Amino acid sequence: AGLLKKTTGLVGLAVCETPHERLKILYTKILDVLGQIPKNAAYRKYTEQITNEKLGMVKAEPDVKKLEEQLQGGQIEEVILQAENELSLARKMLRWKPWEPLVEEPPANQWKWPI
Amino acid sequence: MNIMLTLLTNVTLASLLVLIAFWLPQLNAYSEKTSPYECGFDPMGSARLPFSMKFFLVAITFLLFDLEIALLLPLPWASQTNNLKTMLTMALFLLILLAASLAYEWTQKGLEWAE
């Protein structure tokens, strides 16, 4: 499945010796939080599409290096790092919740910048 | 005689150089030329409040270690004895405790400078 890399190169990004399960558990938590999102939101369908590809993607390939190459996300440690961000984004997305229509149409000439 | 004449001449020479230092160059001074220097902008008020440094522990061990060097100073005349075995054992003994004190001082934070 690939030898344990001595370092990730990036400072602070510690090497994850067990990255496969970490990706699987976080991705399941992604679809978990997306459950609290009603269907109508474009955020739900898009994020589910991204994660569902990724979830069936991490489980298929057992090797780390083929996973990193095919994921197109750099080192594996970045993938858990970004998947964590997607988790926090979806959680705080639930608060603001931008499915609602535009809060206020701007003034007539706020945009349109020839002076 | 000889030693005190040399001591006298040095302090008179130094004091004369001060006297010509503060009197030969005449002064055109004011209250802004006597202001304390703080790399330009106004000082916030300091230079006499408690300025606590960190090497106090090793500063005071120097005083302890300086007493060790006082104890082992008479070694040049100690070698001119008829019982060097006892002199050698005791001379190394003081060095051992001097090394031992440093080693134990080292192990328990000691030489490390407080943050």
Binding site: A42, Y43, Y46, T47, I50, G73, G74, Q82, A83, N85, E86, S88, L89, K92, M93, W96, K97, P98, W99, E100, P101, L102, V103, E104, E105, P106, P107, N109, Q110, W111, W113, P114, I115 | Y30, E32
Partner: protein, 209 residues
């Protein structure tokens, strides 16, 4: 080539940017008012001021955006609008090799949620915006003047603030201290009205009112 002087134009980048512009527009219809891709392949997102934090957070954290570097945060002062200030965000995505522009609007008396939470780089950029223009930002940690001198009056970059300023400086010997006086220029700044009265670009001909 038939255009040795005209800068070449990329359509693939235009299509990719346009597709992403629609993507962000559908994701957060609550703040995204209008989106446009300029002729030289640059994307601008026009959000409502309340969406300053949510929109930036999405661009920073979404797996398909990953815009994780605030290049700069500036505003353009346009007095002719009701909200003269126009705060502009510039973000760069290292993973996807693209840059985005997020712009809001704000009048004189309105606080904007400081983006220090999302981008810690904004912290110092926020002080410049307040100092130069006067836009106050709520929840900012240490909002204070950054560039102008201590006890400075007004906001310089505002279009209604004169270029030479209102006050000059001088060492006054009577008080033995550098003092401030009303400005008195030895030579006034000769303003040059050099705008040709003939239309330049018919493409941007604003329709008559």
């Amino acid at each position: 080539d038939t255009r040795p002087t005209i800068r070449p134009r990329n359509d693939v980048v235009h299509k990719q940017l346009s597709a992403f512009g629609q993507y962000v527009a559908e994701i957060l219809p609550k703040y995204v008012q209008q989106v446009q891709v300029s002729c030289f392949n640059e994307l601008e997102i026009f959000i409502h001021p309340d969406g300053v934090i949510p929109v930036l957070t999405f661009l920073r954290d979404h797996t398909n955006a990953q815009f994780k570097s605030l290049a700069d945060l500036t505003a353009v002062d346009v007095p002719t609008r009701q909200n003269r200030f126009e705060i502009v965000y510039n973000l760069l995505s290292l993973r996807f090799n693209s840059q985005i522009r997020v712009k809001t609007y704000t009048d004189e008396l309105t606080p904007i949620e400081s983006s220090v939470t999302v981008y810690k780089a904004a912290n110092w950029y926020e002080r410049e915006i307040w100092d130069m223009f006067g836009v106050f930002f709520a929840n900012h940690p240490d909002l204070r003047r950054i560039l102008t001198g201590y006890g400075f009056e007004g906001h310089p970059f505002r279009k209604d603030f004169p270029l030479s300023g209102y006050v000059e400086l001088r060492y006054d010997d009577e008080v033995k201290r550098v003092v401030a006086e009303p400005v008195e220029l030895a030579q006034e700044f000769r303003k040059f009205d050099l705008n040709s009265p003939w239309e330049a670009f018919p493409a941007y001909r604003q329709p008559p009112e």
